[PDB]
Amino acid sequence: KKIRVAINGFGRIGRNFLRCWHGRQNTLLDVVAINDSGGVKQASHLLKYDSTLGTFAADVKIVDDSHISVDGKQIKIVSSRDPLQLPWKEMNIDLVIEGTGVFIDKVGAGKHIQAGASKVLITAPAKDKDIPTFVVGVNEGDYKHEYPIISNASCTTNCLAPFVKVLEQKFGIVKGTMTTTHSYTGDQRLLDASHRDLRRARAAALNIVPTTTGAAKAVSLVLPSLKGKLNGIALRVPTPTVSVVDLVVQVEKKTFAEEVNAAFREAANGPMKGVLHVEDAPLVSIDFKCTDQSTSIDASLTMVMGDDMVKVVAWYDNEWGYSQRVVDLAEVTAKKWV
Amino acid sequence: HHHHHHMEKKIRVAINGFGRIGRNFLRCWHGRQNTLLDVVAINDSGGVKQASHLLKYDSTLGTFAADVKIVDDSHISVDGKQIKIVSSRDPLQLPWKEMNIDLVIEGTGVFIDKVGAGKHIQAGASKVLITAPAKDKDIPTFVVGVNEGDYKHEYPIISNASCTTNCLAPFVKVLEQKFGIVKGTMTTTHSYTGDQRLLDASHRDLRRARAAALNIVPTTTGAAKAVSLVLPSLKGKLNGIALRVPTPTVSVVDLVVQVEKKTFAEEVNAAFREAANGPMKGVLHVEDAPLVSIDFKCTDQSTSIDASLTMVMGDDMVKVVAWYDNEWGYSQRVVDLAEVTAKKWV
Amino acid sequence: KKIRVAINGFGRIGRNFLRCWHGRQNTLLDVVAINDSGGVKQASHLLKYDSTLGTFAADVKIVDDSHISVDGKQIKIVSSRDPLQLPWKEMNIDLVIEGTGVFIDKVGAGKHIQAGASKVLITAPAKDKDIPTFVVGVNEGDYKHEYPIISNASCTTNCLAPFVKVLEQKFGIVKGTMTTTHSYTGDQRLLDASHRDLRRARAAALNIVPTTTGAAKAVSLVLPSLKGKLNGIALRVPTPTVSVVDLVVQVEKKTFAEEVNAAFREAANGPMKGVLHVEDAPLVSIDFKCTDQSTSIDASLTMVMGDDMVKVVAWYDNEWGYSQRVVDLAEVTAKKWV
Amino acid sequence: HHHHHHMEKKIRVAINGFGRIGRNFLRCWHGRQNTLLDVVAINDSGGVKQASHLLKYDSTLGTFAADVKIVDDSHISVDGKQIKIVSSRDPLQLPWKEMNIDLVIEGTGVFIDKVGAGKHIQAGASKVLITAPAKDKDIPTFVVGVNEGDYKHEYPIISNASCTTNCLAPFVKVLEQKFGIVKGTMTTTHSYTGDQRLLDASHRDLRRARAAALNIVPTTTGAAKAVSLVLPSLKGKLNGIALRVPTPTVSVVDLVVQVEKKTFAEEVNAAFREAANGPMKGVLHVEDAPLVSIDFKCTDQSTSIDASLTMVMGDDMVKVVAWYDNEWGYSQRVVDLAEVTAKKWV
Ligand SMILES: NC(=O)C1=CN([C@@H]2O[C@H](COP(=O)(O)OP(=O)(O)OC[C@H]3O[C@@H](n4cnc5c(N)ncnc54)[C@H](OP(=O)(O)O)[C@@H]3O)[C@@H](O)[C@H]2O)C=CC1
Ligand SMILES: NC(=O)C1=CN([C@@H]2O[C@H](COP(=O)(O)OP(=O)(O)OC[C@H]3O[C@@H](n4cnc5c(N)ncnc54)[C@H](OP(=O)(O)O)[C@@H]3O)[C@@H](O)[C@H]2O)C=CC1
Ligand SMILES: NC(=O)C1=CN([C@@H]2O[C@H](COP(=O)(O)OP(=O)(O)OC[C@H]3O[C@@H](n4cnc5c(N)ncnc54)[C@H](OP(=O)(O)O)[C@@H]3O)[C@@H](O)[C@H]2O)C=CC1
Ligand SMILES: NC(=O)C1=CN([C@@H]2O[C@H](COP(=O)(O)OP(=O)(O)OC[C@H]3O[C@@H](n4cnc5c(N)ncnc54)[C@H](OP(=O)(O)O)[C@@H]3O)[C@@H](O)[C@H]2O)C=CC1
């Protein structure tokens, strides 16, 4: 009943994924392989020690030049930058977690399947429009085992789509805009240096850095009713994890702050429990670190102007919360496996 | 003889509260090629040692190129010009009558109502300019480039509003003039300030209590409602919040307004460039380069529109992103408002 | 057998102390009161949420206008800035934890005893030379219940004294100097602003800030053989917790790095277990956050030049590690109580 | 005629690697009132768009006051002076012979041995100056103010050492001259650099792999041993470590040496002031004000002794604390060493 999982790209998301999976009380996933350069010494070290996750409580050991163990469970470590040379056939790999960011299209991602894997889950927006995209709590019931390659979307779309779905259900969105005030990521430079994006080129811990986001338009992938309704931008700021979405939408049904928050609470207590949370305490970004939910509505910041302009402020741990959804989506593929 | 040359006379200025705004104000004023302002006194608890040191060395502004010296025990000099340093927590005890002080720059954040700011006038000064929103609703508020032409010498106590309101009101004025505003909301992603705690510690605001360089910290702002004090057609139309982030200066306003006239991003930016090239030159700027927050440090304008970020959704929802150096840019406006009072003096 | 404890000054150390005490498996301490301004709402909120400690797992509730509860145990909250008005007599206060920093002399600290307390433990260097000073792992066996006012010294002395004691035992110190590269503290300003010390006046998160330290000379209080042998300075850097001591000493007995590290390991495995730790992994400051030990020797950084110049690099969580020693010292007073 | 005026001729310079040091070097050179250097080429993968943008806008240095323009598709201009932008990862393909390049500034951190740096000479250049320690032990190393008088035109490949060695060696030279060094150790509390990771990520050095703006990060340094390359009497006498901390520039060396002659803090500082006022003017500075790291940004000297921190324990253990802007100060020395090669050319 368990499925055999391989992680491709042991970066922030790959390592978050493992630690999220290892913390699961009950799981249908058996992680047997990690493809990554740097090898057993980097993989074991960076899995154990983490500047934002903290020290992993599990026993992490280097078994030999191609294996690590986590609390005694051995994991093969491989190290090939080109996917076509991966031993997924020999290792009977069921599902590949694609966390490199590099192979996000059918040609790139499909290479895992050629080398033996049956299914690929991309931890990022797909470049191709023919790769289905899912957000747990929104449209994961639409997933079918017949899909060989799937996308769990971006961390920002996973924050936005759950509370946008509630807004569309209760009040109806006409159009809107969003800004995510977002922790810096590994894509940005530490000091001013080469980058395709001249804003991301600038020292990340010193600056507020505007950058494009696809998340506002990507919401229409999991909520078709949102097509063309939203746009937005990102502001990268000098924090290492936890981000916040600032959404302003014009709604169909005139309303007020407590009625909007009531809708979120109803979803949080029912169909979106564990995915959407409504926070009533006056907190700051660090308080939402390592929260399992995709979205935490900051209830006291909800604002309605002129009856139909609604402003919602939503916290999300863009690393840990997203990785829990990657685990949730992988567990869906396992429970649907034929 | 035939005639004398025209002589605009200089008003005598005292700075009360030699903090970030107080010291920014001094450096902004000292850099002006022309001024009608003669800064003759500073009220700092720390005496000449603190005042000279913190004026010279600045972690945000960098080192002051001017020659700063301790002349004696109650005076410093800036490029040879001496300034008296007084040290009184109570404005009633300040020697303004003795020093013939015309205008007081209130930068303590404490004497922000008629009673408190009025103590300077009881002490001998003629006029008080509060570098903050006034707590008193009958205290007139001005934003240069927006409504400073409504200033009158007969106002003894005036407010230069908040730094966020000074960024917001200029480009909101253009939006209201050209397209008309129905309603709107904003968020300012704002550098941390001295009101925030370095490590989690006591604060009336439980979010401002949290470590400022570690967190995104939501806090209230009156700046969106305050716009209506300088643009009365906007009463009840704007609200917003602030998000304090771990940078030491420069902030950015993100405004979303529903407008009456359907428009598009290039038409909105064209309206800003029109204002920037004409009536709002030096106050409002339109930036075309792909810059980040640090690039707007020590910029003299109140507002820098990030033109590439302008968005319009569904014809009448306009999103505008505007940078502002909340310390230097605001302080240049404090100098400008003080110059208005000098030009219209008596 | 338990003693009744009051905490004066619910700041970083006061709140760290409570959370350290609440985590103790077995304790002789019963914390019944906290004297502090801001009252139940600040005290409950800042006890629950913490930017470096993280969220307190215990249930923290506001019972009424003068009480909070931690997992159901009620704690009276009082709020008087002058110690003389404290109800320690009425509350039968045995021991006061002095964490304000303001009352560090017999006149200041003794005011607690006048108002009813029997003993005062200062969480800082004493201003007076007649107030005995103790460092757990070094000279806590010299404490006597007859001492009404005691000092647990500074966080830097608690890092330095344990491994300095080993160095003096094994090799003999002639003279030395230390620099602590230290996280910023609440004494520093966030932005350039008024301060008695014009260096501490400067923006703390932007700067390397030199400042004086008494810790090098304070070591002679708990190790008399060190009198006049050490001096040093502090460099405050833009991290919120965890610091590192860089000690260079000339020693009597010529030696080498592995022999110096062997001495530390012997103490760490024996008489200084739980106080001194020798770290063999290549770690960074965040990895030592919330470590219970006073001192973590970074073994691979130990260096010996010219046979008798020894350089030792020691990590310490200046908040959590120090607070565990404050708890350890308080537990000593309880076990010695007559 | 009687005579011609004396004409020191300018050598033609190419910058390879337009990073922090490459761009600092350009801005340092452009600010010189006199120079024998004519920078005619830059090798940047990013083409004119990147080069012009990152030269103009700098999060550490601030905005470049000079006029920076894209002239065409292979040239930028700086105050009207054009500079060719080439884009070749392989130095063997660079057009140095075609461009008559005399000297190449190697600031890639890659071509640091005779083979790699020698590729520029195969490509047509005459001499290579590595802005880093040379991996090759026969590559001569120079520190201005210490041993640049031993430089010879007949060296085709030279090293300007590391930024820490440039801070250390000047004030170590004074200590050795006046008191004599037995042995010593140091720690540099150092700003983070581009070799460190923003978030925990892959790195050969498991400590440099850790998030740079969040941590105190110990790392190895050859700078203490490297002093012996420019001061041979110091061979085997110094070692040390580095502690990377969350600041973006400016670093501080903390040196503890046992000396032969018993001394005291004022006598040590007097020795530094002697050097600072005479043979090491412009290289070594003695700071008396109580400053912090940011105050030493964009200081041209290699070393600033924090005089109040000088300590002597037990007569012969001297502790010295010295500030250095590891980007700007070092780059001014790169310009200085390049000027030495120009002055002694052929
Ligand atoms: N960080 C976040 O907040 C989130 C990011 N994501 C997505 O997750 C993905 C990774 O982001 P993140 O993990 O943050 O960035 P990281 O750089 O931290 O992870 C990247 C990892 O991929 C590895 N890698 C790169 N190329 C290859 C290759 N050819 N073969 C094998 N391994 C390779 C890198 O190893 P090396 O260092 O050796 O190149 C690195 O360990 C991206 O698609 C990103 O958009 C989505 C949601 C959350
Ligand atoms: N910083 C910003 O971005 C902007 C702030 N403002 C406003 O400007 C004002 C100051 O802000 P800022 O300068 O940033 O904060 P600061 O704390 O840096 O300035 C405060 C100064 O006031 C002094 N002070 C306080 N009380 C008294 C008193 N009773 N008598 C004399 N001096 C006193 C303080 O001295 P001590 O330290 O000795 O108490 C300190 O130097 C506030 O009203 C703020 O809202 C507006 C726009 C921009
Ligand atoms: N932080 C560290 O790393 C360590 C610090 N220490 C020592 O611990 C002590 C506290 O340091 P820290 O806790 O960091 O600084 P904090 O400011 O965080 O703690 C100070 C607390 O004392 C309270 N306080 C101040 N005056 C009074 C008063 N008159 N009556 C009652 N409560 C008062 C403050 O409340 P309000 O905010 O209302 O004034 C604040 O909560 C100092 O002596 C320090 O030297 C020693 C080792 C570790
Ligand atoms: N930063 C400091 O404090 C100091 C550093 N140094 C030394 O200076 C050198 C550079 O340091 P720094 O400038 O800080 O690091 P940077 O990475 O900022 O400079 C590196 C530059 O080299 C370019 N580059 C890399 N490989 C090549 C190549 N094969 N061909 C052409 N260009 C290339 C990079 O471009 P891309 O980004 O496109 O790869 C980048 O622009 C290093 O040797 C360093 O040790 C010495 C003293 C001071």
Short mmCIF file of N, CA, C and O in Angstrom, two decimals, chain A residues 140-176:
data_model
loop_
_atom_site.label_atom_id
_atom_site.label_comp_id
_atom_site.label_asym_id
_atom_site.label_seq_id
_atom_site.Cartn_x
_atom_site.Cartn_y
_atom_site.Cartn_z
N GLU A 140 -7.82 19.39 -5.17
CA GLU A 140 -7.12 18.11 -5.17
C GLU A 140 -8.06 16.94 -5.42
O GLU A 140 -7.59 15.86 -5.81
N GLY A 141 -9.37 17.11 -5.24
CA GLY A 141 -10.30 16.06 -5.61
C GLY A 141 -10.42 15.84 -7.10
O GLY A 141 -11.01 14.85 -7.53
N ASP A 142 -9.87 16.76 -7.90
CA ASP A 142 -9.85 16.62 -9.35
C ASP A 142 -8.66 15.83 -9.86
O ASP A 142 -8.58 15.56 -11.06
N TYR A 143 -7.74 15.44 -8.98
CA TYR A 143 -6.59 14.67 -9.41
C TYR A 143 -7.01 13.26 -9.79
O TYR A 143 -7.87 12.65 -9.16
N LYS A 144 -6.37 12.72 -10.83
CA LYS A 144 -6.64 11.38 -11.32
C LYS A 144 -5.32 10.64 -11.45
O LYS A 144 -4.32 11.22 -11.88
N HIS A 145 -5.32 9.36 -11.08
CA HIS A 145 -4.08 8.59 -11.12
C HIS A 145 -3.50 8.48 -12.53
O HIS A 145 -2.31 8.21 -12.68
N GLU A 146 -4.32 8.71 -13.55
CA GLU A 146 -3.88 8.67 -14.94
C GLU A 146 -2.96 9.83 -15.32
O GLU A 146 -2.40 9.81 -16.43
N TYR A 147 -2.78 10.82 -14.45
CA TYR A 147 -1.94 11.97 -14.76
C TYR A 147 -0.49 11.62 -14.41
O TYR A 147 -0.19 11.42 -13.23
N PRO A 148 0.42 11.55 -15.39
CA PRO A 148 1.79 11.14 -15.05
C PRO A 148 2.61 12.26 -14.43
O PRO A 148 3.51 11.99 -13.63
N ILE A 149 2.32 13.51 -14.78
CA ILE A 149 3.07 14.66 -14.32
C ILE A 149 2.09 15.69 -13.77
O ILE A 149 1.13 16.06 -14.45
N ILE A 150 2.33 16.16 -12.54
CA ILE A 150 1.44 17.12 -11.90
C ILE A 150 2.27 18.21 -11.23
O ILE A 150 3.46 18.04 -10.95
N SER A 151 1.61 19.34 -10.97
CA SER A 151 2.20 20.49 -10.32
C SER A 151 1.44 20.79 -9.03
O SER A 151 0.21 20.75 -9.01
N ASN A 152 2.18 21.08 -7.96
CA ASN A 152 1.58 21.55 -6.72
C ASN A 152 1.53 23.07 -6.66
O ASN A 152 1.26 23.63 -5.59
N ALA A 153 1.79 23.75 -7.78
CA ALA A 153 1.78 25.21 -7.88
C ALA A 153 2.85 25.85 -7.00
O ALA A 153 3.71 25.15 -6.45
N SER A 154 2.81 27.17 -6.87
CA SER A 154 3.80 27.91 -6.09
C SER A 154 3.33 28.06 -4.66
O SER A 154 2.16 27.82 -4.37
N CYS A 155 4.24 28.46 -3.77
CA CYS A 155 3.88 28.67 -2.38
C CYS A 155 2.88 29.81 -2.23
O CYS A 155 2.00 29.77 -1.37
N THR A 156 2.99 30.81 -3.09
CA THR A 156 2.09 31.96 -3.01
C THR A 156 0.69 31.58 -3.50
O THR A 156 -0.31 32.00 -2.90
N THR A 157 0.59 30.77 -4.56
CA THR A 157 -0.72 30.29 -5.00
C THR A 157 -1.37 29.41 -3.94
O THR A 157 -2.60 29.44 -3.77
N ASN A 158 -0.57 28.62 -3.21
CA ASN A 158 -1.13 27.79 -2.15
C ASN A 158 -1.65 28.63 -0.99
O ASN A 158 -2.56 28.21 -0.28
N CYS A 159 -1.06 29.80 -0.76
CA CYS A 159 -1.65 30.69 0.24
C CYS A 159 -2.91 31.34 -0.30
O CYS A 159 -3.92 31.45 0.41
N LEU A 160 -2.88 31.77 -1.56
CA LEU A 160 -3.95 32.61 -2.10
C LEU A 160 -5.20 31.81 -2.42
O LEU A 160 -6.31 32.19 -2.03
N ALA A 161 -5.04 30.68 -3.11
CA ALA A 161 -6.20 29.95 -3.62
C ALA A 161 -7.21 29.53 -2.54
O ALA A 161 -8.42 29.61 -2.81
N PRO A 162 -6.81 29.07 -1.35
CA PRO A 162 -7.84 28.65 -0.38
C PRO A 162 -8.75 29.77 0.08
O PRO A 162 -9.97 29.58 0.12
N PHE A 163 -8.21 30.95 0.43
CA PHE A 163 -9.09 32.01 0.91
C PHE A 163 -9.72 32.78 -0.24
O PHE A 163 -10.81 33.35 -0.09
N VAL A 164 -9.12 32.74 -1.43
CA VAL A 164 -9.79 33.27 -2.62
C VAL A 164 -11.02 32.43 -2.95
O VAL A 164 -12.07 32.96 -3.33
N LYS A 165 -10.92 31.10 -2.79
CA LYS A 165 -12.07 30.24 -3.06
C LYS A 165 -13.24 30.58 -2.15
O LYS A 165 -14.40 30.61 -2.59
N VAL A 166 -12.96 30.84 -0.87
CA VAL A 166 -14.02 31.24 0.05
C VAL A 166 -14.63 32.57 -0.38
O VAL A 166 -15.85 32.75 -0.37
N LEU A 167 -13.78 33.53 -0.75
CA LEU A 167 -14.26 34.84 -1.18
C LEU A 167 -15.16 34.72 -2.40
O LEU A 167 -16.20 35.39 -2.49
N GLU A 168 -14.78 33.86 -3.35
CA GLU A 168 -15.59 33.68 -4.54
C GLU A 168 -16.91 32.99 -4.20
O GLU A 168 -17.96 33.34 -4.75
N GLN A 169 -16.87 32.04 -3.27
CA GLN A 169 -18.09 31.33 -2.88
C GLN A 169 -19.09 32.26 -2.21
O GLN A 169 -20.27 32.29 -2.57
N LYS A 170 -18.62 33.04 -1.23
CA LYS A 170 -19.52 33.82 -0.37
C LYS A 170 -19.94 35.14 -1.00
O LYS A 170 -21.08 35.57 -0.84
N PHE A 171 -19.03 35.80 -1.69
CA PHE A 171 -19.25 37.18 -2.09
C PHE A 171 -19.09 37.40 -3.59
O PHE A 171 -19.68 38.34 -4.12
N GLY A 172 -18.34 36.54 -4.28
CA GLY A 172 -18.13 36.70 -5.70
C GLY A 172 -17.13 37.79 -6.00
O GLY A 172 -17.36 38.95 -5.68
N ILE A 173 -16.01 37.42 -6.62
CA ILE A 173 -14.95 38.37 -6.95
C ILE A 173 -15.20 38.92 -8.34
O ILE A 173 -15.49 38.17 -9.28
N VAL A 174 -15.12 40.24 -8.48
CA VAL A 174 -15.22 40.89 -9.78
C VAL A 174 -13.82 40.98 -10.37
O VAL A 174 -13.56 40.48 -11.47
N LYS A 175 -12.92 41.62 -9.64
CA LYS A 175 -11.51 41.69 -10.00
C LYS A 175 -10.73 42.09 -8.76
O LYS A 175 -11.30 42.61 -7.79
N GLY A 176 -9.42 41.85 -8.80
CA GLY A 176 -8.61 42.16 -7.64
C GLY A 176 -7.13 42.19 -7.97
O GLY A 176 -6.71 41.83 -9.07
#
